[model samples]
Target: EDVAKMQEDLESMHPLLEEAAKDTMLTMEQIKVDTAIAEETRNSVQTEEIKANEKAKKAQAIADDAQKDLDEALPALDAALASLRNLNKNDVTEVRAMQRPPPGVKLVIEAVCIMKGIKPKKVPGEKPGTKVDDYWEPGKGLLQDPGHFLESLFKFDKDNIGDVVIKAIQPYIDNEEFQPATIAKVSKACTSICQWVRAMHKYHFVAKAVEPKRQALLEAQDDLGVTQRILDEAKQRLREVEDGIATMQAKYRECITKKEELELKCEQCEQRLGRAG
Candidate 1:
């Protein structure tokens, strides 16, 4: 009887033990599967995020580069256009009949462009010799001859281009109140515009290319739209910067003004002391 009772207990314990082992195995497998799924999901999400961020950054960089480039080109474009308009109307004979421009005009123009931060070398297809001539005529002392007739027409004019740049920046150069250094800065800025214009002269094909160029610009309206938006945003941001700077300047000015007033009052008080003495 005792042996039979022990056998029954052993059979019952075997089934329970097997059930527990199976349950534990299933749980472990589930945990491993869950972990793998979670890890894969996380990696996929992270990769997508990185790709998205890169796309956004690339778009922003492209837009920024395009904006800066167009802005720099704008003033030079205007200068060229205005000079061309004058030439078309025959408003100035200086461009048409110039046997040569005055000695320093080209040099000044080139120098001013350099100052403005425009370099001539960046212009496509630029050559070493002046559009006017390859070499100086002897006995003429440089001033007596028509300088090189500006050879390239695409985006250049021989006569009025320099004047246009000078006019563009004249306020800075001509301002009597500006210190020499300040004027120099302004002049340099103008000179950069000058250089940009001279650079355009290298592309004579552009002389007649205006219509096509205008068309191209028209086609790039999307870029222009973005540029306009950026410009608007920049203006607002500039106001914020200006306001902050202005506040700082005002504080300093007010302090100085107050100090001066206080000193003046002290001087008056001192006079009273002298009289009392």
Candidate 2:
């Protein structure tokens, strides 16, 4: 209402109004920093997600091989066991009783042993002298050394114990290892082999072959889980950054409004001073 008060108000507010424009400029700089940081974080998260994807693929391939081994080996083993079971007990006992093995039995023995993959030995005492080669000494097959072959097959981690037994019983029943009429040794071999396969199937084949790959696959999937969370955080961070920028922009707008009102007050005061009578 008076000249002195009007002049005082304009003078006091002028410096504060100047500060408002300067604050708006500072807020723009902060906005630039926020955007740059958000972009950098997004790229780091994206790169890790790609790495986790490759890890999952590698673990899946190993796990798939474990499954394939089971599919092919189990049926072949089951069929081998079924054929051995088909041998008439009477015929088996009669063959077990014979000293000479019926003249035709050796033929069956060679056929079964070779077909099932047990290479014949050098007949234990034959002197090598016919035509320098006389059939290149049959290379060592899987069951060439029956006892050690089981361990090797166990490492293979497939269900081929049935095949093992088929080739194994040849030496036991056909007198390759035992004398006349010792299917008792066959009984011993059969029981021991069955026990060996049982323990091996449970402990080694599934545990050693398949389970590790499954655990690895699960770990890779967990890596992906963490990577996805990392990606989610990047998005969250950008939203938070934008929210902060918006708050600063709102503050700038408020300052502009106050600056405009203060300038208007000074203009009114100057006009009143001009109209002094």
Candidate 3:
């Protein structure tokens, strides 16, 4: 009886054991599938990571090249900036200290232009070949400061005497106490007597360089006069010789005529005597 009971108990647990075995098999199959998927995922991740690493290397190369080019360009940019700063120093100061030119200054420029045969040019937007009968206006395509204005006006003179004029008139242009008439006078004087004024402006004794040359020029001119006097004396002697030759020729012609007349008269008398004989 105990054996039979033991067999019955075994039979009762048999189904449960079978179900647990089947569950264990299913779990193993699922685990195999999960393992395969995990391996595939790991491979995909590794492939993408490799590609990303390659792209990162390429990006780093591009960045390095850009940095190299920038490093080459930076010094060139700095030199250009420094050059601009140095160039603008004087121009900026002049503009800062500049003032609008007086009306008479414009008149003087126009007068000088007229004297120099520079006709007024047509402003932009005018018909082609059209002319304006006005002076240069400030901010109308020209600088407003008198010194610069004069310089612009004289630029076409080819002597660049305009620069000399600017140097001469800069003090007057800068002086606030000067009268307009005085400014105009100074501008005109600078324009007309540019060389003299420039010399004085450089040094009062600058003419020491010029006076000797001028004196030498005068001495040379006197020497030229002496040469001219010698030339005149030679020309006078030539005229006298020509006159003497003319007188001698005239006398010889008269004497020949007289001889011819006397010979003719003697021949007539001899023919008459022969007839008588």
Candidate 4:
């Protein structure tokens, strides 16, 4: 009724002691490797973040350059306008006070102005008869306003002929002929007018080129956003991956507790043998 019988051999106690002696052996070596590999988890998503960060920075520069190019295209338009308007203020009224160009020459000149997007306007004569007879009719002549005459040369695209217009009306433009002043001024002015018109067309091509560049910048920024967003998600994965450390700690802790239980069970086994002996 007491406890263990003397008949039980003490042989079981020797094996239990041997197992307890080996407890916790090589535990540090194993944990060291596990901890080392868990850090590589940091290497994964952080590398992704760095990749996205660089691409986004480059795209920002591209957008800035495109905007600058667009702005650069603006000065040509304004400069051309300044040149054209400046010529308008230089003795243009003398040309307008003269008779209009001949109908044959006039149609050709006005047709060119139409291509340049100018609307025809009626200029009223100085003295109207009474209320409104045909004497008060609209003057559709380009030379009727010196400003319009100047603007027409700049605005028209086809048959760039300040010189051609001067030559066409040549027969009627001796010092005493009709609209001689307007024709003479045109021949002299076309030399500079052609240069100014050339700039306007150059401005057109430059503006068109910038449009596609702007779209290119837009696509580049969009691509950068996608990369950044993907990187954000990758960072989330890394954040979760950091929990791997906890898992590693749990593994080591569980192993140590299991070793403790094994050691304790061995001691109890040996004690039983001691009591019996």
Clashes of each: 19, 0, 0, 0
- In candidate 1, position 77 carries an lDDT of 56
lDDT of 4 by residue, 101-169 (tens): 444334334333433444454544467633321211122354467666665655554334344444433
**lDDT winner:** 2
What ranges in model 3 sit over 4 Å off? 1-9, 66-72, 82-91, 95-277
Candidate number of the best TM-score:
2
User: How far out, in Å, is residue 112 in model 3?
Assistant: 30
Each model's C-alpha lDDT? 0.43, 0.53, 0.45, 0.52
Report the error of model 3 at residue 184, Å: 32
| Predicted structure 3, TM vs. truth | 0.32
Error of 1 at 52 (Å): 2.7
CA error at residue 131 for candidate 2, angstroms: 47
Each candidate structure's TM-score, on Cα atoms with residue i matched to residue i, is 0.27, 0.49, 0.32, 0.45
lDDT of 2 at 207: 43
Model 4 segments more than 4 A misplaced: 1-38, 74-205
Which is superior by lDDT, 1 or 3? 3
> Higher-lDDT candidate among 2 and 4?
2
What TM-score does structure 2 among the candidates reach? 0.49
